[PDB]
């Protein structure tokens, strides 16, 4: 009664007609009103093979979130002056949604790493509301593992492959650029909360690597974009030094709250295509956002050898992985 396939989905949103927010405005064209009564349908006894790492829904969310930016976000200076105005910018949740002749299958397996057979399979006609949060290193307000923690990877042994971890407990980040150096801004994270989780990982990480010590590390090198947790607030790009997050020590004796430095940049590397873009600078006003760390992205050194332990460090930059962190559980399947 069905086979795997790919087709041009459609999006839906609770977007509002006249707010000037860039996400609302994009989706007012592009998307359709949201369904008042969306209906899930648990399926008989059907067992399906999902594969979050080869999912054409990812490639589609990507296309959108790109168009959404290079369009809403106007630089100064041309490309390849342009006048760079200041625009409202908070992402709203976008539902993706099958058209006629296809449906979406959903894995309800609680502990599941978007790969292999599923068994507890549902049928939505529209995914959940996914906010298109573009960021690095950390995955911000979004899904969250219902039961234990989940380590996603296309192949763990190939150190080359990004590792996505799905947190089962959220943790807030309080990032602020106060209302007067203006380019200087910071983030705060309740320390004792965060560490239990990191501890809570490692363990759940150690499980996947033979009870051998799990060591963290700063990133080896590359663009400021990946070396540092990059993200956007109210239109402003933040670059945060996460050396304090992976602070092996604070775990025996230690203390409470954590604080990251973070700088705002106006000359950044595009995530959308190879190049650079200039945006106008901030405004003496206060700029704050507060995200749930719903998960994080790691790489592994391979390296070892093996000594007797594994080294892990921040990664990201391939934004399709952010879309995967949510889309892992859905897949498009045709009927006709």
């Amino acid at each position, epitope marked *: 009664v069905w086979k795997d396939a790919d087709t041009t989905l459609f999006c839906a949103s609770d977007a509002k007609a006249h707010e000037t927010e860039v996400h609302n405005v994009w989706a007012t064209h592009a998307c*359709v009103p949201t369904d008042p009564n969306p209906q899930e349908i648990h399926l008989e006894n059907v067992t399906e093979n999902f594969n979050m790492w080869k999912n054409n829904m990812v490639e589609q969310m990507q296309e959108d979130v790109i168009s959404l930016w290079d369009q809403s976000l106007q630089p100064c200076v041309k490309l390849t002056k342009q006048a760079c105005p200041k625009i409202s910018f908070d992402p709203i949740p976008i539902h993706y949604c099958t*058209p006629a002749g296809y449906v979406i299958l959903k894995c309800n397996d609680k502990n599941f790493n978007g790969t292999g057979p599923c068994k507890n399979v549902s049928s939505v006609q529209c995914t959940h509301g996914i906010k298109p949060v573009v960021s690095t290193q950390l995955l911000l307000n979004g899904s969250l593992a219902e039961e234990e923690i989940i380590i996603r990877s296309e192949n763990l042994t190939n150190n080359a492959k990004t590792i996505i971890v799905h947190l089962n407990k959220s943790v807030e980040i309080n990032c602020t650029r106060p209302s007067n150096d203006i380019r200087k801004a910071y983030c705060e994270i309740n320390g004792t909360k965060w560490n239990k989780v990191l501890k809570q990982v490692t363990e759940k990480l150690k499980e996947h690597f033979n009870n051998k010590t799990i060591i963290f590390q700063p990133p080896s090198g590359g663009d400021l974009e990946i070396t540092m947790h990059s993200f956007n607030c109210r239109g402003e790009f933040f670059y945060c030094n996460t050396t304090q997050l992976f602070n092996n020590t604070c775990i025996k004796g230690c203390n409470g709250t954590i604080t990251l430095p973070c700088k705002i940049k106006q000359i950044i590397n595009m995530w959308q295509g190879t190049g650079q873009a200039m945006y106008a600078p901030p405004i003496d006003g206060k700029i704050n956002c507060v995200s749930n760390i719903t998960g994080i992205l790691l790489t592994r050194d391979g390296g070892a050898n093996n000594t007797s332990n594994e080294t892990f460090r921040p990664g990201g930059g391939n934004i399709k992985d952010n879309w995967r962190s949510e889309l892992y559980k859905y897949k498009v399947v045709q009927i006709e």
Partner: antibody
Amino acid sequence: EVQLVESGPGLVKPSQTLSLTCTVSGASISSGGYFWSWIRQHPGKGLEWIGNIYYIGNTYYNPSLKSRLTISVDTTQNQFSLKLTSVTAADTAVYYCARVPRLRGGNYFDSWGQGTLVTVSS
Amino acid sequence: QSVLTQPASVSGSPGQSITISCTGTSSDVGGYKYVSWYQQHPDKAPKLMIYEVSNRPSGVSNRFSGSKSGNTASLTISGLQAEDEADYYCSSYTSSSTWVFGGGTKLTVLG
């Protein structure tokens, strides 16, 4: 699959109300993903967009017409219709039926009906 | 709710190429990549031929192509033939929140 057919009176008197209905073969919902449009062509002249409606109650109209215009989704929804109050000989036109649709972008009138002529005098 | 402006008429000859222009504003064509093109033929219904500035529906020649720079989009036809002689209409979405067709250009194949 997916044709459309305009059903209704072909004559209306001035100061009266004009009303037509379209009939699907596709599934006004659904399927998708898609809006449902009314569009008209006074003969010898061009196209004028009249309105759009979504399977929910959403309606999008021509600023020119907003005082004398409504669109609806009927019988289980299925089929949608045009109601256009107080008219003149300028409301005479061949009224087409069209689907949009809007997947992720493209906003573009397809599945065109064959249209029905509606003449206006007393 | 503009009116969108196309030249009343154009003309070509077999094998030839020719483009019809569509000019609007920074809110229609400006604006969004939602410019659509239609062929009429007296006396039949309109036929979609280009959507989203430059895309084609399956079953429309390669002769039809769509372009757009700034607030003007254009339809190019190549290897012109008789069966092209028709009215061609332009349309676009519009900021908030409507569509609007163009006047219409009459294609006259000469010779």
